[model samples]
Target: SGQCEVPLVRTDNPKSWYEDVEGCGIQCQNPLFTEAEHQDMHSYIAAFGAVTGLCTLFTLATFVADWRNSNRYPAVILFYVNACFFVGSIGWLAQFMDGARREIVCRADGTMRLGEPTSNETLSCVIIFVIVYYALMAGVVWFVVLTYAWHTSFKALLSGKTSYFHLLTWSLPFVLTVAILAVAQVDGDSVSGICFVGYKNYRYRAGFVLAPIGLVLIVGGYFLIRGVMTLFSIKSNHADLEDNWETLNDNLKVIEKADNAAQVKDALTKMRAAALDAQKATPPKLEDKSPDSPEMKDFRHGFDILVGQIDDALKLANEGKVKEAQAAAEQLKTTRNAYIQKYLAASKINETMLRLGIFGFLAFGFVLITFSCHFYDFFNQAEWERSFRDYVLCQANVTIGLPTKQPIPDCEIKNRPSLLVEKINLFAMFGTGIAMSTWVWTKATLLIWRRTWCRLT
Candidate 1:
């Protein structure tokens, strides 16, 4: 008898369910009999499909709104995020649908035949995956930029220029994204039917994950260092301004006392000149050869007036009063010193207020970024890993012609898709919980640090 060659079937194709199976031994099976599988498969598809559809619609709406509103840049980023979410959901749905269809058509003991590969479908999966991956990368970029803006606003050298800095803050991410995309080439042949094909690629992995993380660390470190320097600079300038004021007040006091002494000397000198002029006007006397006359009494009165003026000016100068000699010298000095000290104190306080506001802003922003990313990853890591694992399992089972009724390995077969669905759902729930907790913690920290400025530099 001649040997009959049976070609090996590739059961991974999407269109295999409708193909002729005369020689392939493939046939459709009833889904109602497998109640648990039916429910799980339906539930997974329905949930993922609904969410992805909603997200897509929302993103489209946001994009339209952004087009109408020219000033809505940040909202544009949110649109991208929604778009990525939609794409990821669609990928999840596609994988689930493929699994469900294959399970229903392939009988327990029959081998399934796969249809010929379609270039379009393969291309679609690759494009969607790449788009989703880059979208996630873009999201991380925006978040990092948001952090940078916060730090710069709080710590920039060109003070009180937050509005200008905001431009750089928002533009940086887009520029980086364009640059990354420009350098990257689309290579879809590697993983034709798999979503997020580039993620599995080593180079793309580094670019999307390790490179961005490194950039963030470098930039964040720079900002923190700069913030510390700025605070110190503010403190130093404040001290210098105070010392300068004290020195100025001391010089003013010396000049004031000198003017008082000069006034007293001028008064005595004028009285002496008047007395000398009167003696020159008197007639000569033979007996005393002296100009003694009634004018002498006027001169004596002038001297008495001069003596009284000198005594008053001396008392005023000694009392440290260039304007009023009412207060004691020590009291006047104390009052002037107090005024100088108050002025310096006020300047210092203003400086401290400004610095504290800046550093406080930086600290808040950095912490917010750190917490948000960590929290997102804390849930996302599990969700994605489970999704990936379930996809592999579903693909494997359908490829092999194993009996559906037979006892399968617990670890290898997924009789229910709900396991993966619930895992993803849990991630969303966990994220919401984390966001709430972080918000409360931020508020509490801000309150605790409220009086930090007064106590520290």
Candidate 2:
């Protein structure tokens, strides 16, 4: 080597050769990115975390209670389903936080100074997504089973027989999940952890969405039809009751007419006997000629006994025994009222059972859709890139004489604090609103169904 030329460095200059890189070097540039401010999402995170924790505790309690109660299948399934919700909610919250962080870190601008994407972080996101997705799917299926069992129990109308239909309800989802997973591909660049993502993952998404939707259409449709039929059957019973009432009225009319005829016949017979007795006394020969009057001949001496009983009844009334007689009369009125109430209650029970079935149908459909959507997302995702993007950042530097500029390591881009805060606020409102509405509606329905103050009229 002839002579080595030492590169000159300027102490006052902020720009460097990295900012002046062109062509192939520009494409290889990597910039550290961050957010303008670290988002104070603790409150939002805490709220969701609390709910998830509570749900999980409830699930564990339910299982323990049921297991102690002789392993009632319903109780076990319900507990597990609740656990699934708890897991799903928690997982979703974690994923949301990770996504927010990723957006903050990947910026090319210096506004946010968050760290780079770590393999651990990406893997965590993928794991949470898969777990939450599957748990929800299983939970919803179990929920549907619970609905069906409830409907069946109600339709049985408090019969002591065990619900046999729960077998199908609980096992179907398990089988479905197994089948899907067995056929699924686990290896590909487009796939991450347990889920598939990107264009090549469409097949998995289709399987999850279309398959469950088809099954739901079949099962849900059947339940809806069965519920409607049950309602019609109840209406038919109402019509039958109306017919019975009409028949009872007709019987009452017949009884009244027979009583009136008997009274009239007795009165006429008494008048004729009186006239015959007078004629017999006025003319002694008439007694031998008229033999015996028809009334006297037919009485066989029972009229005297019947008249004596009537006289005794009248005497008892006159002697202030009227209260006993009135009480006896009121017995019929009370009996009639009792019958009315009984029939009304029976009708209500029938109607209530039908309504339960309707609710079960609704529950089944809702659960099916919720699970299917999650599974679709799980199967379709490629690379499991944080699904949320609240704080995307970008960085750039100017080059004086090059067509392309290189990324300066010290210079970074990130999301603005105010914007991040607003985004978090919007999501917080959304999540809280959903949770509150679901709770309130459930409580209202329970109150309406369980209140004892409902007026029969």
Candidate 3:
């Protein structure tokens, strides 16, 4: 009877897993998912990839549908970034599914069969890797651009030209991906069981993926913090002004007694003079006079009206027509209150929107970091012998060739350590996805309801 034979490879030396066999040359081992926990990892990846892809597509469709509604190019760019991320997610899912069945095989007659991936499979893997890498790189670039646009829009009240961003976000990633493919091989023997740039060429991967993302995470975080602080500072200023109004009212009442009528008039004159001085000090001219929309114009208009009303009240007070002055002063106060309300409401809305955008951006950023960490761990060959045992273990055997009548060899199955770190990384990815999805759904519902209410009215 013919006998079946296979190599008993241990995970202690992962490089040996791909060593030449008796009948087959160097072969790639299947990814380490031979148990329930590993299966759970695959399931989570599939679910996350599928759901995120669908969600991003929906988001893009909504953006297109509402393209004519507003000329917010920054919003458009943001959705485009999500589209890039979605494409990357699809590519990752495809790579996983394509490589899932691949494994080293043992045959009868003491021969082994290496899982020789077909040209089509190889090409597909390379293409998918390029696509995923490019999309992620572009997504990060656009995220940074979007952060800059938001900051400038709010801080300077102007939308800067985005043609440069269009070129940088779309063109640079393509160039980088092409360079990577030209210089290095994309292989499927990865910790994630998907095609990615080879571990040896990790520097290329780091340069193209991790470096840009890390830089953006740092720069974008700074701007986001600065923008939030600016909004809060604006709110604080309004509160201070409100308190000052209360103090002014008290002073006015205190000096309104009959014996102090002359003193009251003199006090009123001084108050008017002080108001005029303030109006001069804080000129209402925003840096960008040409606002993007009627809403922005209204924002500027509200402040202008507030300043003019204050000036009018001061003039009336100086005329010594007490009744008319009081009437003007009351009108000025009303206008000031209106402006403050509008200003505070706009600030709050802007802050909320910015935070939501940051949440989505940072979620994907975390995903990228986890991927990098996984790559780092898998490629650290020097430390693998020492550290590999810390991981969980799993096992599986592959039988090759026609049905064997011979008894199989007693293959020594080693407890190969599973990718526990990679599995743990999934939690971060899943958590980010949940947070972003919640925000997206809530924002979508709110937006749709607002439009519906507007139509009904």
Candidate 4:
């Protein structure tokens, strides 16, 4: 109890010393035997949290540097997502605000104080509490917001009004924090050196903390899948348009397989085919095919008519005048039908599926890891502790001074249900999501760079 700023009184039993006003005792770190393990786990969390924080700042850096580039909903939403991660990772690193009678966790002294974190918690503690409490959840909601926005496909979905998404991401985390505070599940976890729910009351924390993460992760994941599908499908149509123009080896195939009328129109500009030369070139000498000559004039008479009559024909057809429309329709069968009788099929669709499969598989892998990590923590609440769990709490002070100070049984004095794995689980779950988002924004920048800036040269 020497690390405590004030002396902890034994409020319940005579000789059995608990730590705070609430009967929740000093959460033992088993400092006598497991101190090394305890220190390593905590430092591991602190270091990893710092690493993610630095990464997010860098991600945020790139977006700000290219401010004008990311004015759209997807880029703007991603910027906010990275900022939230910056808050959450710093929350984990708050353990640095400790030692010498000052700790940021619920543990004011040796005791992990029970009840609301805002309730008489130190200013440093509340700041840490709020960051860990409310920041990471913001990332999940913002992620879902971005996916839904991007699914619109550069399709003139132009609008800058995004306050609804802001409210969803920011206000949602506040509700989650309020619920945790009401239930008083806030407690200090010595393993991670942070304050989060479920450390003491595993059952309640699972319902609130783990369940929400799983559910939101799924919500965002499905949005990601839909966004990914639109991604490949749009790409295929663009490629199909370009391919339709080039494959005129089949002569009129451009009009047959094209998704729109423009591809066929562009193909008309290049009447560079080998046959047009023979028709436009001079007739053999002494053949009386000189300029304005009867035979030559007659031969060239119908040549100008063939060029884009399909275009002119369709143009007049759109006006819907009776006989002219039929004449326009007749032109398609006259010229386009020769190539139309044989043209297209499903390989492009298969390519769409292949690209979709690649991105969707990779995207869901991150989701599965996060969801499974939450599940493992939920499942282990029953199994990590020993079967004979009730007999070990009060007689715990007997080992207070043995040799190098033997500690109380783990089940009695500590909430030690595989602490390291759970800490690592939080690390993996949060880290993977933020890291994946970083990759996404970066990928988007590179994609635009290739299409817009790089192509200009």
**Model 4, range 1-457, lDDT digits (tens) per residue?**
4322122323443222442234434443432125677777767777777777887786676666567865554456656767887888877776676461136543443455444454544755545666876876777666566556655422331255488788788898899887877776776555566667775466866777677767766775776667665555445533443354244334355444544445544443343232243334333221222577875564344334444564474564345433453344346445433422212221123332333334334534654665676666667666444321332333333343446755533443244355555665766656654564455444665665466555568
User: Residues 264-347, candidate 3, lDDT per residue (tens digit)?
Assistant: 456555555444433332112232234445555665565567556645655655566555545554565566566544443333
List model 1 lDDT by residue over 137-191, tens digit each. 4444443443344344432223344454445434554464445445542222111
State residue 184's C-alpha deviation in candidate 1, in Å: 12
Q: lDDT per residue, candidate 2, 254-326, as tens digits? A: 3334334343333333433432332222111111224476533432233243334334433444454543323
Which number leads on TM-score? Answer: 3
TM-score of each: 0.34, 0.42, 0.63, 0.62
Ten residues in a row with the worst lDDT in model 4? Answer: 339-348
Query: What's model 2's overall lDDT?
Result: 0.38
Once fitted onto the true fold, the runs of candidate 1 whose alpha carbons sit more than 4 angstroms away are: 1-120, 154-194, 198-204, 224-457
Best by lDDT: 4
Q: For each candidate, what is the lDDT?
A: 0.39, 0.38, 0.52, 0.54
Rank order by TM-score, top first?
A: 3, 4, 2, 1
Give the lDDT of residue 18 in candidate 1: 24
Q: What's the CA RMSD for each of the models?
A: 21.7, 20.2, 8.9, 14.5
For candidate 2, the TM-score is 0.42
